[PDB]
Design a binder for this molecule. Structure first.
Ligand SMILES: NC(=[NH2+])c1ccc2[nH]c(-c3cc([C@@H](CC(=O)[O-])C(=O)[O-])cc(-c4ccccc4F)c3[O-])nc2c1
Ligand SMILES: [Ca+2]
Ligand SMILES: [Cl-]
Length: 223
């Protein structure tokens, strides 16, 4: 997160860190055994880390659970990043409490102007790499589809939306990938891609979760 603030320990209880010996992507807990992340964050050997604040210190509240299976959307296109969503099933269910809680899936898609909370342990520099120890947060609005397509002509599909600031300075970045975009308590997006981080007129592009609720529900129900 570039231009964000320190969230405060466990104030984002649904945030998870996907770890393979180091933090590589974020994710969201949607029930006690499933996490939603981005398809491009897929790899084998993933350990899901819940209740984290400082990812380099065991401070208490952490629960490290291995992933039993990762299900990348069947129509994921690694070249366009269209359908950049993945479900991870945990080996054991997590103990939910105030520090570890799931977030609700939406019933409707959000409108432009909706203010959302984006969080993660991704890079904090737009020019260079600085990775934080604790979780960073950024409040950002969903942009209109016309502004989004104007910024990324020919690269936005109906399964994507832009959120952020066209002036640059505040954005999500590499490492935040897979994590949550929550608006009015519902998970509306997944950090997917963007051109650099916090560059003028190049907002972040997110996977539009409201277009995948039936898929998520059907897939969880059959696995
Ligand atoms: N501007 C934004 N709002 C934004 C949002 C998500 C991003 N995710 C990434 C991202 C970038 C990389 C670099 C890799 C490098 O320079 O070392 C790249 O390929 O350009 C990699 C990943 C990535 C790829 C696979 C797994 C985990 C990852 F974070 C990104 O998500 N950039 C991002 C930028
Ligand atoms: Ca920790
Ligand atoms: Cl277009």
């Amino acid at each position: 997160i570039v231009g964000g603030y320190t969230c405060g320990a466990n104030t984002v209880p649904y945030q998870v860190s996907l770890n393979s010996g180091y933090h590589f992507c974020g994710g969201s807990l949607i029930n006690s055994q499933w996490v939603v992340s981005a398809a491009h964050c897929y790899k084998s050997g993933i350990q899901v880390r819940l209740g984290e604040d400082n990812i380099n210190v065991v401070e208490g509240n952490e629960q490290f659970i291995s992933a039993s299976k990762s299900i990348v959307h069947p129509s994921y296109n690694s070249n366009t990043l269209n359908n950049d969503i993945m479900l991870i099933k945990l080996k054991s269910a997590a103990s939910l409490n105030s520090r570890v809680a799931s977030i609700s899936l939406p019933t409707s898609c959000a409108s432009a102007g909706t203010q959302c909370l984006i969080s993660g342990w991704g890079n904090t520099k737009s020019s260079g790499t600085s990775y934080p120890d604790v979780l960073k947060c950024l409040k950002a609005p969903i942009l209109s589809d016309s502004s989004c397509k104007s910024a990324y002509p020919g690269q936005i599909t109906s399964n994507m939306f832009c959120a952020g600031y066209l002036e640059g300075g505040k954005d999500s970045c590499q490492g935040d990938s897979g994590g949550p975009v929550v608006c009015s308590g519902k998970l509306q997006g997944i950090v997917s891609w963007g051109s650099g981080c916090a560059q003028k007129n190049k907002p972040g592009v997110y996977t539009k979760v409201c277009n995948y609720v039936s898929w998520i529900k059907q897939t969880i129900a059959s696995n």
